[PDB]
Design a protein around this ligand. Structure first.
Ligand code: HEC
Ligand code: HEC
Lengths: 135, 135
């Protein structure tokens, strides 16, 4: 597999989004997520994903429970992290991306990377990455 | 004043929070905010703010409109950034912190730094910083 991306918390914050109940992705990715990109990937995002992400790009989808307390949305406990790692050589079947997921204990989750990719094929125009950098 | 903190977007993401209507800070800081700390300040946060932040610490409060569209919370347009810059020498009246605010055009806002500090005095125990680093 891919080793847990130690240090992703200190990478560049790309964007945030909360998926609320009834969202089509709510059952698998419900809650508040933050996206982080490592230094290798950053410039592709800043230029608007017009060229493919270089090999060594790592993108982290950090999913937290969304807690409404009083009149605030707060970050709750981590549910999981999703990872995409670019290596055209290693991952020819999934558009050159390695798809990985880890739970809050940092242990790998048993996922079908092909099922991750199947949805990310919707974003094949921007190298299988949905998110845009929010300045 | 303080020059606009160019490059804060690439600093460490400390935490996020949405203030909803009826929150006591809703009129001035309503929306989704993200907090960023520069490298100088990071370690004080990681150690749980038991010691004061070193001189040269810069913390950014990035406030965005919260847009509910479908069953999602999305980041809307920037409302403002608030900045705290640690310099015990320059800011003896406000606990060694410079308080600054900038609008979306990056232009300074006319604020009373003493009014910022008056509220942050609630957090005098942790060097006038409310937020904790969310691992
Ligand atoms: C559709 C049914 C999806 C499935 C299955 C998976 N992902 Fe995905 N992913 C999806 C969307 C719509 C987005 C964008 C969210 C946003 O805030 O804009 C994402 C994003 C990611 C990211 C961030 C990179 C990006 O493409 O924007 C990563 C690291 C990611 N997803 C990983 C991932 C993994 C590991 C999956 C299988 C376990 C997976 N995704 C499935 C939509 C869908
Ligand atoms: C209470 C009435 C406040 C006034 C007036 C101001 N601030 Fe503040 N600030 C407040 C809280 C409760 C928090 C924490 C928010 C969170 O998500 O936990 C903040 C935070 C900041 C930050 C981030 C650093 C921190 O203390 O956690 C900055 C950079 C900041 N605030 C700046 C700021 C400025 C420039 C103000 C006057 C224009 C100001 N604050 C007023 C509460 C209050």
């Amino acid at each position: 597999g891919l080793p847990y991306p130690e240090g992703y918390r200190f990478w560049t914050h790309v964007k945030s989004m909360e998926l609320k109940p009834g969202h089509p992705l709510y059952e698998s990715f419900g809650g508040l997520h933050h996206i982080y990109v490592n230094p290798t990937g950053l410039r592709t995002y800043l230029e608007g994903k017009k060229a493919p992400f270089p090999k060594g790009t790592v993108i982290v989808f950090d999913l937290l429970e969304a807690k409404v307390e009083g009149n605030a949305l707060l970050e709750g406990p981590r549910k999981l992290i999703g990872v995409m790692a670019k290596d055209p050589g290693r991952y020819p079947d999934t558009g050159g991306w390695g798809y990985y997921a880890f739970g809050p204990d940092k242990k790998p989750l048993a996922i079908d990377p092909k099922a991750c990719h199947a949805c990310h094929q919707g974003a094949a125009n921007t190298d299988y990455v949905f998110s845009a950098f929010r300045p």
